[PDB]
């Protein structure tokens, strides 16, 4: 039976804990362990990777399937020697449900004027603010795949008006959607913009000043909000900053940044209407990752086709 | 046609805005207007009241129905001269949906360790924290009426494990519930305690140190959280403070207080794991209030029975 290489830059206690009883019957080679730093890795069919070392695929030339530890593959596609074999991304109910938690939290924080109420609290001042209900706000989600769909349905169920956008059009009860050419109509209706796009050459810098200026100003706060949990390379941070300073954006939630970890010198840390999280919108449940990997190995070895394979030309 | 007295201590622009076109065919006497401060109010059948003046029912001895501006009636029951006629409380989809927004926000803030991530941000420090999913947390809701039920269903749909408690037992898909005697078993399973009880003589001071000590310590954070949006008189704030200081409570969200507005000298304002909101968990949509009132007047006058009538002996 082939070994499984595990090269995951995740919280190490979580990886170690999940290894126990994982991949039964297979040797598991965890490259976090210094004992394994010189081991040759030829003749091994499977690797599970997240921020893996540059020389990995030169050490493991015989891989038959590469498994990403995350849903996003923009970094893995750039790794030297990435083999010409299927690359399977992480898709799982645990990941999806976690992202929807984060998206719901952001939409509620901005809806319920959390920062305004915290500023009042800091002054020890009791003051009720006029308050729209979720149905008074349209959330527009750019990115209508696994995560965008689950987030949209959950937002709608909480009472938000929800609309969606992606390259092609899709059918989702209670959610009107737009295809690529509908972008401007979608943006003009959107009060809270949620980014759940992969980073690809075609989504690079898509979230810029010109796009923020097209968002709706007709909503209950008079200015839109930007929430991104896709990839940082999709946004132009200089524009986000300028828009926040001018009031073109009323606030933002950012889980992802052009350069991560976010520099300690960034202005985003101290800004009163920005919520910064360190790329934790949906943590990979490592146990679930390994169950997904085990499952796909079983299909592969039985001749069934792999699921969630990446289109490497498209970048997702 | 009888006039309608409106004596509502709500945001005045909201009341004024909602008056337009309200109660068509009836004189509307808004007691916020100084012009009406000496008007006699006999021969008037209806009043809509929230924090109304003490002498109101002596000025209006002929009321046939009193309408509260809120869901809660503990204050109105204490008003001098409250007539011996039906008292109808506010119940409406707008109110319910708003409360569920607030409850969902609190459960997510505590689940997603928002204060920990804000403390990291204040130090300009990028650090991922181990993170449970909502299904790892049990939310126990004390109070299973209109609001408790809607909040429970919405929490469950977001992935939380949800359990409920109230005097009598109730049947709710996906939510196990407990009756009065099941209190201790319910508390022992609960990680996040949500209060959606009326204030009555029987719920006064129910949320105390003895009760907080019975909450589960087996959850992912090792200590429970207290969230109250019912009434402040149900909690003992001295105990909440002591429990937070000792770590018996890991955090709290409080929308209601023993004395409101909350004193500017309260410690709750500055406490890092408390979220204070100024009794805004669900604002009355005044427009919807008047539609509800108009509707009930129509039923009353057609001989149909009034809905949402309070049991004045029970206090709710
Ligand atoms: N912050 C975090 O912790 C975190 C966690 C997990 C994932 N993520 C990010 O979230 C992303 C989405 O994940 P997912 O599972 O939902 O992906 P998915 O199922 O592949 O969905 C991707 C969506 O983006 C659309 N899209 C791609 N390129 C586009 C373009 N140029 N114009 C318009 N639409 C475009 C796709 O449209 P089509 O269907 O028409 O192709 C599809 O609707 C991942 O790529 C990852 O970067 C972040
Ligand atoms: N913070 C805010 O902005 C805000 C806004 C709206 C409402 N509220 C508060 O929320 C409360 C609940 O509203 P609601 O519409 O959900 O009320 P509801 O429909 O009357 O529900 C009340 C629930 O509390 C239970 N209950 C009452 N006394 C009890 C006792 N001694 N022991 C156990 N259970 C008891 C009732 O049980 P039974 O069914 O068995 O009687 C019922 O399940 C209101 O009274 C108001 O004070 C606050
Ligand atoms: Cl800001
Ligand atoms: Cl605290």
Question: What residues flank ligand 2, with Cβ below 6 Å?
Answer: B 70-72, 91, 99, 143-148, 166-168, 180, 196-200, 202-203, 229-231, 255-256, 279, 281-282, 316
Residues 6+ apart with CB under 8 A from A240: A207, A212, A226, A249, A252, A254
Ligand 2 atom having least distance to the Cα of B99 = 5
Residues 6+ apart with CB under 8 A from A238: none
Radius of gyration, CA atoms only, chain A: 21
Closest chain B C-alpha to A68 CA, distance in angstroms: 19
Packing angle, helices A93-111 and B93-111, rounded to 10: 120
As beta bridge partners, residue A72 has none
Residue A152's nearest CA partner among A82, A216, A99 is A99
Q: Annotated catalytic, B231?
A: yes
CB B251 within 8 A of CB B212: no
Q: Sort A313 into a burial class: Cβ within 10 Å, 0-12 / 13-18 / 19+.
A: exposed
CA-CA distance, A273 to A292, in Å (whole number)? 38
Q: What is the 3-state secondary structure (H, E, C) of chain B?
A: CCCEEEEECCCHHHHHHHHCCCCCCCCEEECCCHHHCCCCCCCCCEEEEECCCCCHHHHCCCCCEEEECCCCCCCHHHCCCCCCCCEECCCCHHHHHHHHHHHHHHHHHHHCCHHHHHHHHHCCCCCCCCCCCHHHCEEEEECCCHHHHHHHHHHHHHCCEEEEECCCCCCECCEEEECHHHHHHHHHHCCEEEECCCCCHHHCCCECHHHHHHCCCCCCCCCCEEEECCCHHHECHHHHHHHHHHCCCCEEEECCCCCCCCCCCCHHHHCCCEEECCCCCCCCCHHHHHHHHHHHHHHHHCCCCCCCECCCCCCC
CA-CA distance, B212 to B210, in Å (whole number)? 6
> Resolution of this entry in Å?
2.0
Residues 6+ apart with CB under 8 A from B302: none
Q: For residue A124, which residues of chain B lie inside 8 Å, CB to CB?
A: 264-266, 269-270
B116 lies within 8 A of chain A by CB = no
CA-CA distance, A129 to B11, in Å (whole number)? 8
Domain map (residue ranges) of chain B: 1-95+283-316, 96-282
Packing angle, helices B146-158 and A93-111, rounded to 10: 130
Question: What residues flank ligand 1, with Cβ below 6 Å?
Answer: A 70-72, 91, 99, 143-148, 166-168, 180, 196-200, 202-203, 229-231, 255-256, 279, 281-282, 316
Cα B77 to chain centroid, rounded: 16
Residue from A93, A94, A97, A128 to probe the interface with B (highest B Cβ count within 10 Å) = A128
Q: Which of A101, A261, A265 sits opposite B134 (nearest CB)?
A: A101
- Are the Cβ atoms of A266 and B108 closer than 8 angstroms? no
A220 lies within 8 A of chain B by CB = no
CA-CA distance, A137 to A219, in Å (whole number)? 6
CB B204 within 8 A of CB B123: no
Q: Which of B111, B129, B279 sits opposite A101 (nearest CB)?
A: B111
Phi, psi of B176 (to 5 degrees): -75, 140
The order of strands in the sheet holding B87-88 is B28-30, B4-8, B46-50, B65-68, B87-88
Of B50, B51, B72, B234, the one to substitute when testing ligand 2's pocket (max ligand atoms within 8 A of C-beta) is B72
Cα A267 to chain centroid, rounded: 22
Cβ neighbours of B159 (radius 10 Å): 21
- Are the Cβ atoms of B105 and A112 closer than 8 angstroms? yes
Residue from A70, A154, A263, A277 to probe the interface with B (highest B Cβ count within 10 Å) = A277
Supply the CATH classification number for the domain A1-95+283-316.
3.40.50.720
The CA–CA distances, whole Å, from A200 to A148, A204, B87 equal: 17, 6, 61
Residues 6+ apart with CB under 8 A from A42: A59, A60, A61, A62
- For residue B107, give both structure tokens: 């459960």
Tokens 């939510």 appear where? B175
Residue B229 labelled as part of a binding site? yes
Ligand positioned closest to the Cα atom of A245: 3
Q: Sort A34 into a burial class: Cβ within 10 Å, 0-12 / 13-18 / 19+.
A: exposed
Packing angle, helices A286-301 and A12-19, rounded to 10: 50
CA-CA distance, B121 to A218, in Å (whole number)? 32
Half-sphere exposure of B76 (CA within 13 A, CB side): 28
CA-CA distance, A233 to A201, in Å (whole number)? 10
Closest chain B C-alpha to A255 CA, distance in angstroms: 11
Q: For residue B109, which residues of chain A lie inside 8 Å, CB to CB?
A: 105, 109
Q: Which of B100, B101, B128 sits opposite A280 (nearest CB)?
A: B128
- Are the Cβ atoms of A108 and B111 closer than 8 angstroms? no
Ligand 2 atom having least distance to the Cα of B91 = 15
Closest chain A C-alpha to B261 CA, distance in angstroms: 6
> Which sign, positive or negative, has the C-alpha torsion B156, B162, B163, B167?
negative
Residue B264's nearest CA partner among A3, A124, A209, A303 is A124
- List, as one string, the DSSP characters of chain A: ---EEEEE-S-HHHHHHHHTT-STTS-EEETTSGGGSS---TT--EEEEES--TTHHHH-TT-SEEEESSS--TTGGGSTT--SS-EE----HHHHHHHHHHHHHHHHHHHTTHHHHHHHHHTT---------GGG-EEEEE--SHHHHHHHHHHHHHT-EEEEE-SS---BTTBEEE-GGGHHHHHHH-SEEEE-PPP-GGGTT-BSHHHHHHS-S-STTSS-EEEE-S-GGGB-HHHHHHHHHHTSS-EEEES--SSSSPPTT-GGGG-TTEEE--S-SS---HHHHHHHHHHHHHHHHTTPPPSSB--TTTT-
Residues 6+ apart with CB under 8 A from A195: A142, A143, A207, A226, A227, A228, A229, A230, A234, A235
Tokens 């009031």 appear where? A247
Give ∠ CA A69-A71-A72 in degrees, rounded to 5: 100
CA-CA distance, B158 to B160, in Å (whole number)? 6
CB B67 within 8 A of CB B266: no
Ligand positioned closest to the Cα atom of B206: 2
Ligand positioned closest to the Cα atom of B250: 4
Residue A312's nearest CA partner among A85, A147, A90 is A85
Q: Domain B96-282, what fold?
A: Rossmann fold (3.40.50)
Ligand 2 atom having least distance to the Cα of B281 = 3
> Which sign, positive or negative, has the C-alpha torsion B194, A113, B73, B147?
negative
Residues of A annotated in the binding site, as ranges?
89, 144, 146-147, 168, 170, 229, 255, 282, 316
Ligand 1 atom having least distance to the Cα of A280 = 3
- Are the Cβ atoms of A276 and B109 closer than 8 angstroms? no
Torsion of CA A4, A6, A7, A10, to 10 degrees: 160
B46-50 and B4-8 as β-strands: parallel, antiparallel, unpaired?
parallel
CB A224 within 8 A of CB A249: yes
Residues 6+ apart with CB under 8 A from B7: B30, B31, B32, B47, B48, B49, B50, B52, B53, B56
B121 lies within 8 A of chain A by CB = yes
Cβ neighbours of B274 (radius 10 Å): 21
Whether cis (ω within 30° of 0) applies to the bond prior to A251 is no
Whether cis (ω within 30° of 0) applies to the bond prior to B132 is no
Tokens 């689940």 appear where? B111
Cα B244 to averaged position of ligand 4 atoms, centre (Å): 5
Closest chain A C-alpha to B34 CA, distance in angstroms: 23
B98 lies within 8 A of chain A by CB = yes
Domains A1-95+283-316 and A96-282 are alike in CATH topology: yes
Ligand positioned closest to the Cα atom of A89: 1
């Amino acid at each position: 039976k082939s070994p499984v290489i595990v090269d995951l830059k995740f919280i190490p206690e979580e990886v170690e804990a999940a290894l126990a009883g994982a991949f039964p019957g297979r040797e598991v080679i965890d490259l976090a362990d210094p004992a394994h730093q010189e081991r040759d890795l030829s003749g091994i069919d499977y690797a599970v990777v997240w921020k893996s070392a540059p020389d990995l695929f030169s050490r493991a030339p015989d891989l038959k399937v590469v498994f990403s530890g995350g849903a996003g593959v923009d970094h893995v596609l750039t790794l030297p020697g990435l083999p010409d074999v299927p690359l399977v991304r992480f898709v799982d109910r645990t990941l999806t449900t976690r992202m929807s938690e984060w998206v719901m939290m952001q939409c509620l924080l901005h809806l319920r004027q959390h920062r305004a109420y915290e500023a009042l609290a800091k002054k020890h001042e009791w003051r009720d603010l006029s308050q729209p209900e979720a149905a008074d706000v349209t959330v527009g989600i750019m990115g209508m795949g696994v995560l965008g769909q689950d987030a949209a349905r959950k937002l709608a169920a909480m009472g938000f008006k929800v609309i969606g956008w992606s390259r092609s059009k899709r059918v989702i009860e209670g959610v009107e959607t737009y295809d690529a050419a509908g972008l401007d109509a979608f943006l003009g209706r959107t009060d809270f913009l949620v980014g759940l796009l992969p980073l690809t050459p075609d989504t690079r810098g898509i979230f810029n000043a010109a796009l923020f200026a097209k968002l709706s100003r007709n909503g209950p706060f008079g200015a839109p909000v930007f929430i991104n949990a896709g990839r940082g390379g999709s946004q132009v941070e200089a524009d986000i900053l300028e828009c926040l300073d001018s009031g073109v954006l009323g606030g933002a939630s950012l889980d992802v940044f052009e350069r991560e970890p976010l520099s300690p010198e960034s202005r985003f840390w101290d800004m009163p209407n920005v919520y910064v999280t360190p790329h934790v919108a949906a943590s990979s449940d490592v146990r679930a990752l390994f169950v997904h990997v085990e499952h796909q190995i079983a299909r592969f070895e039985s001749g069934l086709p792999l699921e969630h394979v990446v289109d490497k030309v498209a970048g997702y």
